[PDB]
Amino acid sequence: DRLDAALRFQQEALNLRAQRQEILAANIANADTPGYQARDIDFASELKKVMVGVALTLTSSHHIPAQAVVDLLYRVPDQPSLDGNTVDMDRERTQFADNSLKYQMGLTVLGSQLKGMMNVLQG
């Protein structure tokens, strides 16, 4: 559908921001686990990958339709801890706040596009 193509980029950006938000909050929650590595995703490359499948064929009514079913990069440690935990509070707190801001911005842009498509139709 053409409607999907217009809203594909912002939807994928919003979903990627939510996933990275979950990853950052997981990094915050597991700050005290000894031996836990701080993981993160490269937002731009994954957004390229998602932006850049074959529903199985249903011959009749009984035939069952096809059933549907990111890469994590390690953060470079800054300070060496003794328990092997590489999670840094300041870095991930700033990243968490930034991801929240960008999620809000994506919501704003997507809502503006939908509202414009709506006022085009209203009449």
Binding site: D32, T33, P34, G35, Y36, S81, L82, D83
Partner: peptide
């Protein structure tokens, strides 16, 4: 398999 957090795992101890 993370271990004890905080004080015990942040003290220099010989490996065993």
């Amino acid at each position: 398999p993370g271990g004890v957090p905080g004080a015990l795992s942040n003290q220099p101890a010989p490996p065993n």
